[PDB]
Amino acid sequence: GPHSMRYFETAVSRPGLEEPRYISVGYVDNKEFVRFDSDAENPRYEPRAPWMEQEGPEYWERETQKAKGQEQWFRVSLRNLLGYYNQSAGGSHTLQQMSGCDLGSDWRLLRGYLQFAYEGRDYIALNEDLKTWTAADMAAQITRRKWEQSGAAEHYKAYLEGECVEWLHRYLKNGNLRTDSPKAHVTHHPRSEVTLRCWALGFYPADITLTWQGEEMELVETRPAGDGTFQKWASVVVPLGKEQNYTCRVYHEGLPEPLTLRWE
Amino acid sequence: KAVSNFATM
Amino acid sequence: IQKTPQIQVYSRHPPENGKPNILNCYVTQFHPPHIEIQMLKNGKKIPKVEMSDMSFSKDWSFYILAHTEFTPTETDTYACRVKHDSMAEPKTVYWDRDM
Structure with missing residues (x-):
């Protein structure tokens, strides 16, 4: 490397x-x-x-x-x-x-x-x-x-x-x-429609990509947890009932391959 | 190994 | 010339009411490097706030991480307030446990 x-x-x-x-x-x-x-x-x-x-x-x-x-x-x-x-x-x-x-x-x-x-x-x-x-x-x-x-x-x-x-x-x-690989999970936040927010936690180094999808959204800048590792999330507002159509993908250098995740 | 500059600006 | 601080407020660990955690205030993308950062509980300055050493990024802008021990509750509200020469008034960002 x-x-x-x-x-x-x-x-x-x-x-x-x-x-x-x-x-x-x-x-x-x-x-x-x-x-x-x-x-x-x-x-x-x-x-x-x-x-x-x-x-x-x-x-x-x-x-x-x-x-x-x-x-x-x-x-x-x-x-x-x-x-x-x-x-x-x-x-x-x-x-x-x-x-x-x-x-x-x-x-x-x-x-x-x-x-x-x-x-x-x-x-x-x-x-x-x-x-x-x-x-x-x-x-x-x-x-x-x-x-x-x-x-x-x-x-x-x-x-x-x-x-x-x-x-x-x-x-x-x-x-x-x-390197430390990201551990990912999706959170669920009902509103008017539900916000699905994909979290990446515990990773190092800080470079990471989060995507929602078939086809390619709010996010935050990657941030330090304060312990040597970093955090990031990305969200999408998604129809109530139809949350399984959406998948979050996490790209990090520590991963054998990109994580794919959904609300479960 | 810290760099040590040459001519001043 | 002045670059205005970007601010995020967030906990180190997933928050659980009643359980001690660390609250962070991450302040980036600012110039000049002189800055005042305060972390607030219910609008009042928290007295024992730890400050990282100041560092700068490859675009020459400065960044710093402030943090403090805290225990989230259903009802207490946490925030970070920043004073910097690029802003006429201080900027306050409130902690949202879901962000």
């Missing part, structure tokens, strides 16, 4: 605060594994899953200094951006980064990622070639030119193809993957 690593980083400035708040979250296979928060009493990268406790003290020391370096980088970048957009003092501002790698089932690099947002909107991104930059904003051209002239892309490329892949291999070995 395929694999991935991501670091999602955020710095926020506020009218009062002397220094921005910086938060970094690391993910392996879309599951949080490390976290740094500058608001902590003694800010350090901390493990977020049990399998990371295997890493010794020098690992945490190095990563913590990386994060403190990022915190400085974000502080300076936030200041530079304020200038680029002619934003005055007295506002709140946000700078975000996503970076990392996707591996195929063979554990080889499929794609590197490096994108940034200012005020929640795309600012600059490293293209899939890992050599050139896309920047929409006129203000972002200043940064694009600066990074073209400094050769920033070659260095990010080296990280993405080297370190990102190599350390993801090490984390997949130490973390040795699993």
